[PDB]
Structures are given as C-alpha cells and as structure tokens.
C-alpha cells in the first residue's frame, strides 16, 4: 500500500492521473520523482522548469555542480540527485527530444532507467515540449517499465485521449 490517490490502473504496474506533477510531488513526497531532463540538466521549461521552480532553483544549483564534475548525460540515460522539497530523490531521465532530431528508439532505453526503482512518480518521457507522440510514449512505458510507476499527465484533454485510446 502507498499514498498515491485517484489513479487509473492501466496494467499490473502502471497507473495514470490527470495531475500537475509539481503539486502531486508536494502532496505525496514520493521516494522518487522523475524529471524530464536534458543532457545538460538545464531545467528551463516543461516538467523540468516546473520542478526546478518549485525547489526555488536548488535543483538547478545541484545540477550545475553535477555537470561540472561529470559532464553531460547520454540521451536515454539518467542520474539520481536530491528530490529537495519534492521527494527523497529525483531521477533525472533524458528522453529523446524529437525537436532535436534525436532517435525515438532511445525512448525505450530512457524508460529502462525506471526499473532501478521500486516505485516512482513520473511524466510521460519525450512528450510535451520534447515533441513525441504521448500515446506512443505511454505504450513504451507500459511495455518497458516493470516497477510501479504513477504517471502524472498535466493536460486534461491529453489525459482523456490517453485513457480512451489505451489498448
Ligand atoms: O505529458 C505532459 C504534457 C503537458 C502538456 C502538454 C503535453 C504533455 C508533460 C510534458 C510537458 C509538460 N508535462 C507535465 N507533466 C506533468 N506535470 C507537469 N507539470 C508541469 C509540466 C508537466
Ligand atoms: Cl517537458
């Protein structure tokens, strides 16, 4: 039993809810919140900008030190950093940004990072401003993640389409 509330169950291990991931994180304080990161951990917009704003820029400060030490992530890769005031940990995961020409096949590799954590709150990778089809992203999620994932979809109109079209 966990404290996630109001999710629709899609499969044995995947759940979904129309919700602002920032507001969800502040309520649940999950062990792991997933950020829709880029390789530079520059949290400018989308989910990343919103999560960072909610940490009063502490996420960005920590991220800049991470990059200075380690260099950029790989597309499809991840790192674990602090969750600050939102969660115990933040798993920064880089899905391909179609608007940069990045290989959509890397979306499965990106979701594989979730399997290193038993329970996660997360957005649909590569969706929104990353330019991929959110319906496709949900399919890859369900077919790749085996751990328990609670998906927050910000756009209510998009949420309804994802549910109604889910196979
Ligand atoms: O799939 C969502 C989406 C939202 C709008 C249009 C298309 C897709 C992702 C991708 C872009 C942002 N987003 C979010 N998801 C959950 N919580 C969020 N808080 C702030 C942003 C955000
Ligand atoms: Cl985003």
From Swiss-Prot:
Catalytic reaction list: Thiol-dependent hydrolysis of ester, thioester, amide, peptide and isopeptide bonds formed by the C-terminal Gly of ubiquitin (a 76-residue protein attached to proteins as an intracellular targeting signal)
Regulation: Inhibited in vitro by GRL-0617.
Top-rank lineage group of the source organism: Viruses
Cellular localization per UniProt: Host endoplasmic reticulum membrane
Residue ranges of domain Macro in the record: 1-167
Membrane topology: Multi-pass membrane protein
Role noted for this protein: Responsible for the cleavages located at the N-terminus of the replicase polyprotein. Participates together with nsp4 in the assembly of virally-induced cytoplasmic double-membrane vesicles necessary for viral replication. Antagonizes innate immune induction of type I interferon by blocking the phosphorylation, dimerization and subsequent nuclear translocation of host IRF3. Also prevents host NF-kappa-B signaling. In addition, PL-PRO possesses a deubiquitinating/deISGylating activity and processes both 'Lys-48'- and 'Lys-63'-linked polyubiquitin chains from cellular substrates.
Subunit structure: May form homohexamers. Interacts with N protein.
Protein name according to UniProt: Papain-like protease nsp3
Lineage of origin: Viruses, Riboviria, Orthornavirae, Pisuviricota, Pisoniviricetes
């Amino acid at each position: 039993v966990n404290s996630f509330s109001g999710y629709l169950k899609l499969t044995d291990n995947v759940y979904i809810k129309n919700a602002d991931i920032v507001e969800e994180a502040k309520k649940v304080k999950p062990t792991v919140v997933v950020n829709a990161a880029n390789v530079y951990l520059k949290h400018g917009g989308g989910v990343a900008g919103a999560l960072n704003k909610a940490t009063n820029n502490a996420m960005q400060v920590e991220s800049d030190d991470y990059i200075a030490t380690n260099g950029p992530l790989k597309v499809g890769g991840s790192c674990v950093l602090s969750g600050h005031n939102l969660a115990k940990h933040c798993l920064h995961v880089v899905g391909p940004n179609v608007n940069k020409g990045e290989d959509i096949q890397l979306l499965k590799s990106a979701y594989e990072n979730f399997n290193q954590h038993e329970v996660l709150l997360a957005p649909l990778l590569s969706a929104g401003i990353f330019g991929a089809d959110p319906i496709h992203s949900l399919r890859v999620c369900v077919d790749t993640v085996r751990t328990n994932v609670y998906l927050a979809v910000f756009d209510k109109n998009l949420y309804d389409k994802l549910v109604s079209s889910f196979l």
